[PDB]
């Protein structure tokens, strides 16, 4: 679990969004595993606007942060799960690192701010849904 809070928006994994997230829906994209809902309280986070390929992410299944080198956002095949059919997930960045069910929502950050959130795992890999292209989150 986990979310990004920026301005009057909350960014979560689409497959973990709550009834309240859906009742206050701003935008969602099943192909990216993202959903953004509106909030009344002002958010605590700032979004990176950069091309960094190194950063640090929080891994809840280890209660630790790990440094990673990750690929540029791209279209990557993801195996079927209880949440999605087998499909290509877009705007996804892969890295070598630990991730298991329960780790989705952990934040990936670089020196400029929030880059994205954990969205895929297994096989000693961790995949992050990029949010750096969502410029409207900042206004
Ligand atoms: C049960 O899923 C897993 C199985 C083995 C290892 C890892 C997972 C789980 O790692 C977080 C994962 O990758 N996904 C489940 C949730 C939806 C994710 C997606 N389609 O963006 C895919
Ligand atoms: Zn950066």
> Of 113, 23, 103, nearest to 66 (Cα)?
103
**Residue reference for tokens 């960014």:** 11
What are the phi and psi torsion angles at 22 (to 5°)?
-65, -35
Strand partners, 47: 114
Per the annotation, the verdict on 59 as an active-site residue is no
Distant-in-sequence, close-in-space partners of 9: CB < 8 Å, separation ≥ 6: 26, 36, 37, 38, 39, 43, 137
Separation of 22 CA from ligand 2 center, angstroms?
Answer: 30
Q: Which ligand is nearest to the CA of 78?
A: 1
The pair of structure tokens assigned to 103 is 């780790």
Name the method of structure determination: X-ray
65, containing H or E segment = strand 64-69
Cβ contact 50:10 at 8 Å: no
Q: What is the DSSP string of 79-132?
A: ---SSS-SEEEEEEEEEES---TT-TT-EEEETTEEEEEEEE--TTEEEEEE-T
Name the active-site residue from 21, 59, 104, 130. Answer: 104
Cβ contact 6:47 at 8 Å: yes
The distance between the two most distant Cα atoms of the chain, rounded to a whole number of Å, is 39
Distant-in-sequence, close-in-space partners of 85: CB < 8 Å, separation ≥ 6: none
Separation of 120 CA from ligand 1 center, angstroms?
Answer: 5
Kindly report the number of other CB atoms within 10 A of residue 31's CB atom: 14
Separation of 125 CA from ligand 1 center, angstroms?
Answer: 11
Distance of CA 127 to CAs 3, 20, 39, 72, 97, Å? 16, 26, 27, 11, 9
Q: Is 67 helix (H, G, I), strand (E, B) or coil?
A: strand
CA dist., res. 116 & res. 129, Å (int): 5
What are the phi and psi torsion angles at 107 (to 5°)?
-85, 140
- Is ligand 1 within 6 A of the CB of residue 129? no
CA dist., res. 25 & res. 9, Å (int): 10
Per the annotation, the verdict on 19 as an active-site residue is no
The pair of structure tokens assigned to 91 is 């705007």
Resolution expressed in Å: 1.5
Calculate ∠ Cα 46-49-50, nearest 5°. 130
């Amino acid at each position: 679990s986990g979310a990004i809070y920026v301005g009057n928006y909350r960014v979560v994994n689409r497959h973990l969004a709550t009834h309240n997230d859906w009742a206050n829906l701003v935008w969602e994209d099943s192909s990216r595993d993202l959903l953004v809902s509106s909030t009344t309280a002002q958010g605590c986070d700032t979004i990176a606007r950069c091309d960094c390929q190194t950063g640090v992410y929080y891994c809840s299944s280890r209660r630790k942060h790990y440094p990673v080198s990750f690929s540029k956002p791209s279209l990557i095949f993801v195996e079927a799960s209880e949440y999605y059919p087998a499909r290509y997930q877009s705007h996804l960045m892969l890295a070598v690192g630990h991730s298991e069910p329960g780790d989705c929502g952990g934040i990936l950050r670089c020196q400029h701010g929030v880059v994205g959130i954990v969205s895929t795992g297994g096989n000693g890999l961790v995949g992050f849904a990029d949010v750096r292209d969502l410029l409207w989150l900042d206004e």
